[PDB]
Ligand binder design. Structure first.
Ligand SMILES: COc1ccc(Cc2sc(N)nc2C(=O)O)cc1
Ligand SMILES: [Zn+2]
Ligand SMILES: [Zn+2]
Length: 231
């Protein structure tokens, strides 16, 4: 059974096996008063591991690396942040100190700079236009356009038909759009469709927060967006 926010004390991390050599990681952090859960991805990359997003903070991210070492036992060598918020780059400095090569789009890097957040080292070339995609070891990184934020990425894991939505895809239980400060509600519905388009095959879709699903998570998000465009 998937772990829920109330089962993960702040400072602990959980690994959850999705498919052969594909796990999610789950952690918890406070924000504007209140604690929320947050997801990321781990994909085997030959004899190494590829990290999709931090565990939302330095302490969580240290505990992630340690759980990884305890449960999987292969070194984490690269990480990719999918947008510039703290649930995506918070802990990049720990990764860096651990010896992980960190990566992100050039726009994600500039925006973390402006926000005062931690900044990944390496720029991901080839992700500038709505619809671009590049192969990053065992995964495909894909830029569907603005949504939750202007830079936000999603990742697809070919060999397993896993699609990682990042904070661009809500979980069904979630019906309020929550914080959309840096959002473009206008393009957001189009970008989800850009996703559905490119990844029709996804058998498993993971939101940035909460419980995983199938392609239905795309449409549910859309509704919840539009229900807020209107009012
Ligand atoms: C699934 O339950 C929830 C409810 C609300 C939030 C608000 C936050 S905090 C954070 N670091 N990201 C978000 C987001 O919406 O992307 C996150 C998860
Ligand atoms: Zn965000
Ligand atoms: Zn988020």
């Amino acid at each position: 059974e998937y772990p829920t926010v109330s089962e993960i004390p702040v400072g602990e991390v959980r690994l959850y096996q999705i498919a052969d050599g594909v796990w999610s990681h789950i952690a918890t952090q406070s924000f504007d008063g209140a604690v929320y859960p947050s997801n990321g991805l781990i994909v085997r990359d030959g004899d190494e591991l590829l990290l999709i997003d931090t565990a939302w903070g330095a302490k969580n991210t240290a505990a992630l690396l340690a759980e990884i070492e305890k449960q999987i036992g292969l070194p984490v060598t690269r990480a990719v942040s999918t947008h510039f918020h703290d649930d995506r780059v918070g802990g990049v400095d720990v990764l860096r100190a651990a010896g992980v090569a960190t990566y992100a789009s050039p726009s994600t890097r500039r925006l973390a700079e402006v926000e005062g957040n931690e900044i990944p080292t390496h720029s991901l070339e080839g992700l500038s236009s709505s619809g671009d995609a590049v192969r990053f070891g065992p995964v495909e990184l894909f830029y569907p356009g603005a949504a939750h934020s202007t830079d936000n990425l999603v990742v697809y894991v070919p060999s397993a038909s896993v699609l990682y939505g990042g904070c661009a895809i809500y979980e069904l239980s979630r019906t309020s759009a929550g914080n959309v400060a840096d959002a473009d509600l206008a393009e957001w519905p189009t970008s989800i469709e850009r996703i559905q388009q490119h990844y029709p095959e996804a058998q498993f879709v993971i939101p940035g927060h909460g419980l995983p699903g199938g392609l239905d998570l795309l449409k549910h998000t859309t509704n919840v967006v539009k229900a807020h465009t209107n009012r």
